[PDB]
Nucleic acid binder design. Structure first.
Ligand code: K
Ligand code: K
Ligand code: MG
Ligand code: MG
Ligand code: MG
Ligand code: MG
Ligand code: MG
Ligand code: MG
Ligand code: MG
Ligand code: MG
Ligand code: MG
Ligand code: MG
Ligand code: MG
Ligand code: MG
Ligand code: MG
Ligand code: MG
Ligand code: NA
Ligand code: NA
Ligand code: NA
Ligand code: NA
Lengths: 77, 110, 142, 176, 45, 56
RNA sequence: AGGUGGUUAUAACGUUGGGGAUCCACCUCUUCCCAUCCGAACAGAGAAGUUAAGCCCAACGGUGCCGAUGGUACUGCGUAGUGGGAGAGUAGGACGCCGCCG
RNA sequence: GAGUGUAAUGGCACAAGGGUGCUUGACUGGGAGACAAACAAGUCGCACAGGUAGGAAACUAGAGCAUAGUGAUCCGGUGG
RNA sequence: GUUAUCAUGAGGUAGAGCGACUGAUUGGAUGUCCAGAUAAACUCCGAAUGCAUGAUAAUUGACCGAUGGAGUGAGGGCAUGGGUGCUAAGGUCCAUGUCCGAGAGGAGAAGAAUCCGGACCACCGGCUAAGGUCCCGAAAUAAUUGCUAAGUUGUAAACGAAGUCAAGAAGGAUUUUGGCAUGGAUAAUACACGGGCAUAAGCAAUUUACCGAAGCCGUGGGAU
């Protein structure tokens, strides 16, 4: 009578942080992800852990394209 | 696998970083068996700003210089410098290099 | 006894049967069948007893179909074992069914024999059932 | 081969409208095909009782009140999971312009020789056929007077009329 | 078998690791000498 | 262009969201009447607590 | 009959025919730039030859792709009512639509 | 439907998968702004100055497809 | 700060599906094909709700910073989504609400959390909620239409016989879906509609009036 289980690790709080429509300052973290679930578009950079962050200030836009690939970009002025 | 699937594969690798704006327009070259062409393109607009070719104008490498120079004069009048040179799936060699060298030697920072 | 040849996992969480069956509520193979009116786990021992009963009738002329397969593992702790300390000893497999799901299909026999043969099989089952005849059937040709 | 059906107009749609319709022992129904939009209407359980619960097939001559008159065939019947009662029907409009696939009963009309012993077995009870609606038989007769031993007549090895056997050729339509 | 390494030649030092059973020769890499403000060769000690 | 709303059921054992909707309407006591302009924002508040209020 | 973009294939794939004014292509040879075991690829040097193939045009619902209306499942609130409403399948659509340059 | 040294999951075709040529950015001085969050800790990322590598150039490089491979303070050792 | 509306955004649950993958799987013709079908650790698909941002509206003001003082860190019931257990437990472990805790009043005969309802004080005033109106016990032996014959009722099943009422189907017989009853129905100090007792004073339906709380209103008097 025993269990060989009982283990788990801490969750990483991953996901979208700034949604489409909101305003971002340069440097703001937009998406925490494993791999490129979302892809960097215009004015958006990618970190070592595939973190998506804003290179310029503006409006966050999501956009689906060929093969339902999602891109994240910043719309400036 | 058919002389074009590889070229399109190389084309998209070059286009992953090279594009054109109103400033620094893209310099694009197409090499046929007999001729050679060039084009200045504004990707945001989508329209061509200038062009040159040897259809209506020495070995083939000796004729790419004239194309590489005639594209400079066309851009010199329109007020273009510091273009960006894309390979278009072409190895930087031979005729294509002479076209790039002539464009750089003129008024463009190709 | 009807059970998977192999499984990917040894244990399974006890799920939840929610509504009426939306698949397997229509006869496809035979002309007569029995359909459940309750949601319940059906064991392999229950199915074997019912199938032997219906096959014993109709002599040796006709074909019987089992339209459910028990693929859900279940466990049981046993006597003198307190709550906790993990899952219990394995106890075979069951098939969960919802109201409307057809269990036994019969073909090759006249109307009256089929009605009686599936009545004996339904009396070995833990759920109340209902006789169904296919709507394209002809009473004047059997 | 022909059935007479009529139906009342249907206006409201949705969960509330349909549930109230069947409270009067009615069935929601639609008709569509070829040119023109569909028609929403209401039939009754008594009216369609002999159209569906039957070993026969018919070319429905449908007269929807308030809209017009058409010709149609049964396409889809929706049954309740537990009560086995009809809850929805859609009729496909048929015209004399292009064929339409439908399945007609096939009848094994004496048996070949002494036969292998009470076999005379009808396996494939229905066969898909595409043709003009006025060329589809009420039945698919077969004469069986050869190979009393172990034999089978396939779907491909048969030619009836200006029909088209789409019923999954290289299959088996009778045996023994 | 992966140990610390200290490349040398105030003085300029760089700390790094290497497998002492795979790379058996002393490490010699060109690095930026802050004191001289130019690249020089740093060898393992 | 106005509309009068009366509370007729208690707010005991109601979800916090419904309790907060009555506050946004101004209702804090049984049988109390409030008056408002019948705009789409106010109408969505009444529709959320329709089982608790009356239009009078 | 070319180059280069936009639109998430209704755009793709495929099938059967047509095309050589000029273009694109296959094509001929490796002394040179450059390359692999091999000028097959990549590169250079030519126009002696062909439309056979890629390529473009017409027609085709063939494989994929898009897809209703109605009905149903599910569900928020609420204790039968009041709102939201799939997936699958069926009628159908579709052999692209737009810019710039030569 | 393979691979990605190593569990699982997510990702990867312009490949992040496989080859070669040259190389040491597995840089010195750095942290606008964010994620995460009892605290202690953790995570992603500048601008530009100095000097490099690859490249025709544009450009990329402050280690590795990502997420585990760990241990405070006190007390001692070594180099400036 | 909150709630509603509008705009914008990212989802992979419920459901569904399986020639869209992996695993599992039924019957046929014969790896090929035709049907049938499954999953917490399957997904070609995919809601309702919820979540984030902005604007407008309403909102007794409900939010935040600094700084003085705390207590708490044994919870519990119910509903919904689940794991575990035996689809046991007034069981156990989470999530979302709610109430008891720290909450009196009314109904339920008598019950911490079921139904109604949040008690400033007084009153020999009035209107209502849940639930009721033959008597104990406040208010209809009220009106109208059916059902039940079992005192069922007024506060369990597989399986029999179909006792009776309504609406049909096929063609006196069979049968289908509803409604109410009947057998199955079962231990130990004496038993239960709470009791009397009722053939309606039971059940279903519609209608009016009335009764009913510390709820609301009225009158007087205080407080923050
Ligand atoms: K009671
Ligand atoms: K009163
Ligand atoms: Mg985790
Ligand atoms: Mg719909
Ligand atoms: Mg900072
Ligand atoms: Mg499910
Ligand atoms: Mg399923
Ligand atoms: Mg403690
Ligand atoms: Mg505790
Ligand atoms: Mg408990
Ligand atoms: Mg539980
Ligand atoms: Mg306890
Ligand atoms: Mg309380
Ligand atoms: Mg009295
Ligand atoms: Mg006793
Ligand atoms: Mg009061
Ligand atoms: Na745990
Ligand atoms: Na609902
Ligand atoms: Na759909
Ligand atoms: Na499957």
């Amino acid at each position: 009578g025993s269990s060989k289980n009982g283990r788990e690790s801490e969750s990483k709080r991953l996901g979208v942080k700034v949604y489409g429509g909101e305003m971002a300052k340069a440097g703001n973290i937009l998406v925490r992800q494993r791999g490129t679930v979302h892809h960097p578009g215009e004015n958006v950079g990618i970190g070592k852990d595939h973190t998506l962050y804003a290179l310029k200030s503006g409006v966050v836009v999501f956009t689906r394209k060929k093969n339902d690939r999602s891109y994240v970009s910043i719309k400036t002025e | 696998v058919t002389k074009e699937q590889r070229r399109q594969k190389i084309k998209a690798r070059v286009r992953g970083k090279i594009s054109g704006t109103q400033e620094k327009p893209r310099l694009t070259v197409f090499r046929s068996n007999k001729q050679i062409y060039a084009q200045l393109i504004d990707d945001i607009a989508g329209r061509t700003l200038a062009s040159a070719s040897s259809l209506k104008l020495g070995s083939k490498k000796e004729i790419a210089a004239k194309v590489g120079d005639e594209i400079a004069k066309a851009a010199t009048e329109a007020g273009i410098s510091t273009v960006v040179f894309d390979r278009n799936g072409y190895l930087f060699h031979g005729r294509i290099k002479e076209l790039a060298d002539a464009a750089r030697k003129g008024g463009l920072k190709f | 006894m009807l059970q998977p040849k192999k499984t990917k996992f040894r244990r399974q969480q006890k799920g939840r049967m929610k509504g009426f069956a939306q698949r397997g509520n229509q006869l496809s193979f035979g002309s007569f069948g029995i359909k459940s009116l309750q949601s319940k786990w059906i064991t392999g021992r229950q199915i074997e007893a019912a199938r032997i009963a219906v096959t014993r009738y109709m002599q040796r002329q006709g074909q019987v179909w089992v339209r459910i397969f028990p693929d859900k593992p279940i466990t049981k702790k046993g006597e003198g074992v307190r709550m906790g300390k993990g899952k219990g000893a394995p106890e075979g497999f069951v098939a969960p069914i919802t109201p409307g799901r057809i269990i036994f299909e019969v073909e090759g026999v006249p109307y009256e024999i089929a009605k009686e043969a599936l009545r004996l099989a339904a009396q070995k089952l833990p759920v109340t059932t209902k006789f169904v005849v296919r709507h394209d059937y002809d009473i004047q040709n059997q | 081969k022909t059935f007479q059906l009529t139906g009342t107009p249907r206006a409201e749609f949705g969960k509330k409208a349909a549930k109230a319709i069947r409270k009067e022992d009615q069935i929601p129904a639609v008709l569509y095909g070829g040119k023109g939009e569909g028609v929403n209407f209401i039939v009754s359980q008594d009216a369609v009782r002999n159209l569906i619960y039957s070993p026969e097939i018919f070319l429905v001559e449908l007269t929807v009140e308030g809209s017009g008159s058409y010709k149609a065939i049964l396409k889809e019947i929706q049954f309740h999971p537990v009560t086995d009662r009809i809850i929805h029907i859609d009729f496909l409009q048929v015209t004399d312009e292009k064929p339409v696939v439908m399945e007609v009963p096939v009848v094994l009309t004496h048996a070949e020789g002494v036969k292998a012993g009470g076999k005379l077995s009808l396996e494939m009870r229905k066969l898909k056929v595409k043709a003009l609606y006025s060329e589809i038989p009420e039945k698919l007769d077969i004469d069986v007077s050869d190979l009393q031993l172990g034999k089978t007549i396939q779907v491909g090895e048969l030619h009836f009329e200006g029909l088209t056997l789409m019923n999954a050729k290289n299959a088996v339509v009778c045996a023994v | 078998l992966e140990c610390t390494e200290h490349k040398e030649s105030g003085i300029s030092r760089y700390i790094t690791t290497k497998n002492r059973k795979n790379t058996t020769q002393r490490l010699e890499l060109k690095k930026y000498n802050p004191i001289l403000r130019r690249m020089t060769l740093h060898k393992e000690i | 262009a106005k509309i009068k709303i009366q509370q007729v059921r208690s707010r005991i054992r109601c979800p916090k969201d419904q309790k907060r909707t009555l506050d946004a309407l101004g209702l804090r006591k049984l049988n109390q009447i409030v008056e408002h302009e019948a705009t789409p924002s106010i109408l969505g508040m009444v529709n959320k607590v329709r089982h608790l209020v009356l239009i009078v």
